[PDB]
Design a protein around this ligand. Structure first.
Ligand SMILES: O=C(O)Cc1ccc(CNC(=O)c2ccnc3ccsc23)cc1
Length: 167
């Protein structure tokens, strides 16, 4: 038993809710919240900008030190950093950005990072401003992630569409 509430169960291990991932993280304080990161960990907008804003920019300060030491992530890759006031840890995962021409097949590689964590609160990778089809992203999630994932979908209209079209 865990503390996530109000989720619809899609499969053995995937759950979904219409929620703002920032407020969901603030209440649950999960072990892992996933950020929709880019390779530079520049958290300017979308999920990343909202998560970073909720940390009062501490996420960005930590991220800048990470990049200065390690260089950029790979598309499809990830790193574990602090969750600040939102979670124990933040798993920064880089899905392909269709608005940058990145290969959508890298979406499966991105979701594989979730398997290193037993339970996660996460957004749909490559959705929103990353320009992928959220329905495809949900399918890849279900077919790739084997650990327990609680998906937060900010847009109520989108949430209803993902549920109604789920196979
Ligand atoms: O919700 C988030 O977590 C981030 C986010 C993703 C997408 C949109 C735009 N809406 C849609 O793409 C959309 C809305 C309703 N039906 C469909 C069907 C195929 S796409 C689609 C806004 C926010």
């Amino acid at each position: 038993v865990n503390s996530f509430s109000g989720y619809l169960k899609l499969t053995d291990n995937v759950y979904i809710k219409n929620a703002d991932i920032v407020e969901e993280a603030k209440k649950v304080k999960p072990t892992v919240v996933v950020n929709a990161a880019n390779v530079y960990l520049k958290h300017g907008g979308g999920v990343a900008g909202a998560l970073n804003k909720a940390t009062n920019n501490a996420m960005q300060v930590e991220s800048d030190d990470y990049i200065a030491t390690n260089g950029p992530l790979k598309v499809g890759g990830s790193c574990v950093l602090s969750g600040h006031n939102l979670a124990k840890h933040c798993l920064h995962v880089v899905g392909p950005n269709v608005n940058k021409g990145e290969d959508i097949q890298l979406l499966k590689s991105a979701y594989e990072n979730f398997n290193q964590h037993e339970v996660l609160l996460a957004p749909l990778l490559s959705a929103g401003i990353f320009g992928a089809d959220p329905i495809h992203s949900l399918r890849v999630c279900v077919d790739t992630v084997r650990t327990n994932v609680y998906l937060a979908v900010f847009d109520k209209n989108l949430y209803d569409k993902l549920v109604s079209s789920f196979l």
